[PDB]
């Protein structure tokens, strides 16, 4: 029938991160089909401000890709997550940013 393919997800910073230094937080969501998706950037479970969405792309197997990014100044207590909801998931899934520091 139709494709149903869940995404895989990579979270990462534009630069090597240092505590209190302004940076950019990237969430790259790929491999999904169909295109309907929700992708949220969370600071300790709060919606982040200034979240932007790249134009979605797809590749040779027609599965879609999306980049979602937002400015952020990380610390050692803060937990940054990307929460992705997609019909091939039984339920939303978080993917955590793992610090550089």
């Amino acid at each position: 029938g139709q494709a149903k393919a869940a995404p895989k997800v990579q979270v990462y910073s534009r630069h090597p991160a240092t505590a209190g230094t302004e940076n950019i937080l990237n969430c790259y969501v790929e491999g999904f089909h169909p295109p309907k998706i929700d992708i949220a950037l969370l600071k300790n479970g709060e919606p982040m401000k200034d979240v932007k969405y790249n134009d979605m792309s797809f590749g040779d197997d027609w599965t879609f890709q999306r980049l979602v990014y937002a400015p952020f100044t990380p610390t050692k207590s803060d937990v940054y997550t990307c929460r992705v909801d997609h019909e091939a998931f039984t339920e939303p899934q978080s993917f955590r940013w793992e610090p550089d520091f």
Binding site: Q10, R14, H15, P16, D55, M56, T63, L67, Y69
Partner: protein, 271 residues
């Protein structure tokens, strides 16, 4: 010196947030430069070089072409619903087409169609015939090869028009396309149960191809490495990582090696 122009069409029966009924994105050498969807109904720029195109009412015209053609995407979506005896609901129609300039100056062309996330029909412009993937696709093969006109019309565009615009596009975006941006590399350390997990991260390289590897006293460690896919940054650059699990006394024998077009010789990094 090789270059690519490709357009990606996504068309769906049921919109949803961030998914219009039809969207089209053009890419030059893999970087977006032109966008259109059925909500704004307007062709808009995605790269700065497109802003000095020199064609005057080019934007007004190409906008109109797109507005007119989304009618045909809605029709093909219903055709495909009934040909495959589906109900009404969510269905998905996808298209990738464009041309390539290879380093010897020869041309390649492509026009590929996808229904429900599965191959449907692909142009083989060499023979002016379509490769069908399906019983349902075989019909559209036979209808297109009956009428006679589409295969050669699309072969014409691919071999002439498309390529003509490619070269013009390459010379407007010469400076963006040929810029180079080095990676910032940092190696991170984390051990838990007497295993040290070394993570090498390369941030902000352009162009996209990169080599990242791990050295144990100078010898590659190709099986003990897992690496991620090169993933994009927001500013057109790219990102990759590579971890290795090693033992915490074997720590000062470990180097990450980053080969990139931006650096004459590979960089070496430790934690």
């Amino acid at each position: 010196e090789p270059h690519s122009v490709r357009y990606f069409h996504t068309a769906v029966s049921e919109p949803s947030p961030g998914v219009p009924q039809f969207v089209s994105v053009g890419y030059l050498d893999g970087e977006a430069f032109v966008y259109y969807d059925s909500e704004t109904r307007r062709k808009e720029p995605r790269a700065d070089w497109t802003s000095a195109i020199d064609d005057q009412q080019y934007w007004e015209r190409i906008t109109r072409i797109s507005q007119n053609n989304e009618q045909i995407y809605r029709v093909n979506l219903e055709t495909l619903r009934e040909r495959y005896n589906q109900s009404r609901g969510s269905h998905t129609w996808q298209r990738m087409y464009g041309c390539d300039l290879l380093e010897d100056g020869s041309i390649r062309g492509f026009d590929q169609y996808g229904y429900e996330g599965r191959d449907f029909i692909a142009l083989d412009k060499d023979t002016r015939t379509f490769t069908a993937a399906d019983a349902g696709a075989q019909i559209t093969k036979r209808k297109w090869e009956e009428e006679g006109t589409f295969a050669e019309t699309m072969k014409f565009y691919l071999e002439n028009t498309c390529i003509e615009w490619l070269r013009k596009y390459v010379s407007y975006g010469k400076d963006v396309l040929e810029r180079r941006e080095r990676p910032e590399v940092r190696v991170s350390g984390m051990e838990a149960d007497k295993i040290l997990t070394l993570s090498c991260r390369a941030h902000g390289f352009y162009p996209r191809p990169i080599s990242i590897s791990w050295l144990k006293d100078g010898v590659v460690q190709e099986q003990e490495t897992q690496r991620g896919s090169t993933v994009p940054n927001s500013d057109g650059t790219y990102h990759i990582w590579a971890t290795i699990d090693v033992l915490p006394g074997d720590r000062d024998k470990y180097q990450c090696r980053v080969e990139h077009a931006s650096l004459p010789q590979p960089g070496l990094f430790s934690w």
